[PDB]
Amino acid sequence: LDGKDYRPEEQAAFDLLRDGLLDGISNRKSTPKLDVYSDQIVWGRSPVRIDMAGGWTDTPPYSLYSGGNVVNLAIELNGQPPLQVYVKPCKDFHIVLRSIDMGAMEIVSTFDELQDYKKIGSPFSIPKAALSLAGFAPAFSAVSYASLEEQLKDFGAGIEVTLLAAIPAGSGLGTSSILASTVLGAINDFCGLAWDKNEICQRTLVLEQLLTTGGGWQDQYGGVLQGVKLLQTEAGFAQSPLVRWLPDHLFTHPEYKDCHLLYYTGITRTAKGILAEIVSSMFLNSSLHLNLLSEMKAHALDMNEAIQRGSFVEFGRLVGKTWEQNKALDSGTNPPAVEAIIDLIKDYTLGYKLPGAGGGGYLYMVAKDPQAAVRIRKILTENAPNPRARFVEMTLSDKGFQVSRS
Amino acid sequence: LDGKDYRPEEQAAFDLLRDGLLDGISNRKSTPKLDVYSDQIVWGRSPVRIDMAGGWTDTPPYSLYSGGNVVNLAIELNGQPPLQVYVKPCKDFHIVLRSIDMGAMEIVSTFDELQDYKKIGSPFSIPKAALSLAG
Amino acid sequence: KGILAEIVSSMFLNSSLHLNLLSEMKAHALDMNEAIQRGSFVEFGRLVGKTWEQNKALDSGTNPPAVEAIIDLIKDYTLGYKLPGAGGGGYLYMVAKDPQAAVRIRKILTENAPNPRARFVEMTLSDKGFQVSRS
Amino acid sequence: KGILAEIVSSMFLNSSLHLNLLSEMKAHALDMNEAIQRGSFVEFGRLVGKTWEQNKALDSGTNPPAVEAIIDLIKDYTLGYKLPGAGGGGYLYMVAKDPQAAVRIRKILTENAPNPRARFVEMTLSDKGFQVSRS
């Protein structure tokens, strides 16, 4: 702020931010995973959150510490859930990361460090951290990933792991985070180490630190679990329960006073390079941010009580409120083409939001009832770039985990 | 059967068997496929038959000609259907066949013939023929 | 399968009582569809076991006696079965009365369990089966 | 029920430790909803058996020992239960681990079967519940 070494000031803050989140978890372990066994294929899969309310009450700096609460949902695009991961043993001691919609391959055994790469943002980056199980142990070495695999699996793979996302990371749906978590669930099945959903997400957040994205963290509990989150509570250092539930049930038995909400991209994301800055600029330093943050939390409890009674009409109010509560608030980045899609309609009947990020991606919005379908006719009518302008639903459908079949 | 050139006899029968089935279809065409478009991913999927009855009444030689009948079913293992195929555009003018449970890759643009390979029975062999649109 | 499709294509209308048995496989298929077209589930099961007989004892007698040990027990509880498709490996299915069926699952649960595992797998009729191109 | 609603309305805030126990019934209800609001199904079962205790041993101690013979066996396999609503007749429900539950169905299937029959009846959550005026 004075003048001098902002980049080093950012570096000092960044390293301290990491060190702040470097605390701290069991173990980091040493475990020789075994399970698979050979012939199998382990396939995981996961639905995708949105956050109705309870917005950036996530994302350290929270309140600071403590906590937040988000209550979000965890839902599904038409089929498949998507975000689905395949992982297999092989013959050839080089851990291949293999992607689709981008992926040629990532031939890996070096580690080099491990894995941990914000180095080249081939989202193969995310499976790197998926090898951060610990990902160390006795008494192996760099060549002796030979030992790692070929006593672990033992199953002489150099494991080849093959994800799939359906949607780009310009979703504002936390898809990166969810994806990583799902991989970790597949590992937990895969060759061993026997974990929990929650501690899956714990260790996920732990590596999400070194993933160095701002930890949009609501999602990784959200989209894995089912239609609630709720209660981010402790947030130091950073402690993370947060659980309990809610009926949906007015997202199903369906309303049918519409019987819901659904999608418009016509807009790509910017993507996000200023947003998580304004988050982590700052902590309990500044400003009325901290203020507005606090009643986001309040409005989240508002939310859950509301639909915990079933006030669907007021559910819609609180949705539009959250929209207001971020659009006009932090962060005022929603780019006026979005507002043209808001413009028409705003009308017919009620409110909306951008989930998650904002500044691209896609909304959803609730109406009365079949005037809703006439809104589908409205976006059907105009405002249709080739980022298409759909009904996409959403489709609450959820548990979301894995198979290891057969 | 007499003695002599069973392998050539099998070869003659094999080529005649092919030539018998070489007949014959529209077109083989020329079509410039376009659709995709770019950003998309096309994912296919399929359930798996069994045949309750109506066994090898399939499989030329049938009766010979004609016909058979099988009536079988078309069913599904628990989920996914399985047998599911993803296919995508890219940047890099080499048709990659990519498999899973075996597949490293098959980098292809040669054709060489086309595709058509009973050459190495990497079941990438099957997508070769999948490029036989005509091809 | 390296002998099976040989015995198929050895031969055409050359030989033998194959051609004979082939013909009533077709007949038995029409038998099948009429049967379950009326809903004679019990007789559906008969015709399944018949098809098994109609290929096991018939072309092709390749079903390897470990399969027959899995047949051996049970054969019993209640009714028949087949290997779909190829035979000589892979996996069967079989129909019973009703929950004695689940006790058969307990039977294969009990023994006869190599690491090619010995499951309920279902099957699960569920079907259309095509593609998405989403979105 | 001719004594039960008496003990209810004998009395109001007159007497006794009734009023006491009543109050933590309310407390235990908030216990309940928070419990399954988190999904602690195992603890859901605990609180069910607690409510049973909280009325059986408590107001009202009317549950007639034949009921307790149906409790007797089982109590076991695995977890608790209650009589809904009144008590002193009618019918329970009870939760177990998992298919040991079905073996409990085998247990009540085995014995303890007067002609007020001894069933699985389910229950079956299914609900909105109103009217038609059709058409």
Numbering used by the authors:
A (entry chain A): 544 to 949
B (entry chain C): 544 to 678
C (entry chain C), D (entry chain D): 815 to 949
Can you quote the paper on this entry?
We overexpressed and purified the full-length wild type FKP from Bacteroides fragilis 9343. The overall structure of FKP exhibits a tetrameric organization. The tetrameric organization of FKP is mediated mainly by the CTDs. Two interfaces are identified in the structure, with one interface formed by a six-stranded β sheet interaction and the other by a loop-helix interaction. The fucokinase domain of FKP, as predicted, adopts a GHMP sugar kinase fold. For the glycine-rich motifs, result shows that the T602A, G757A and G902A mutants have greatly reduced fucokinase activities, while mutants with R592A, D594A, G597A, G598A, D601A, G758A, G759A, Q761A, D762A, G899A and G901A, respectively, retain hardly any fucokinase activities. This suggests that this large pocket surrounded by the highly conserved residues is a potential substrate-binding site in the fucokinase domain of FKP.
In bacteria and plants, the two independent catalytic reactions in the salvage pathway can be accomplished by a single enzyme, the fucokinase/GDP-fucose pyrophosphorylase (FKP).
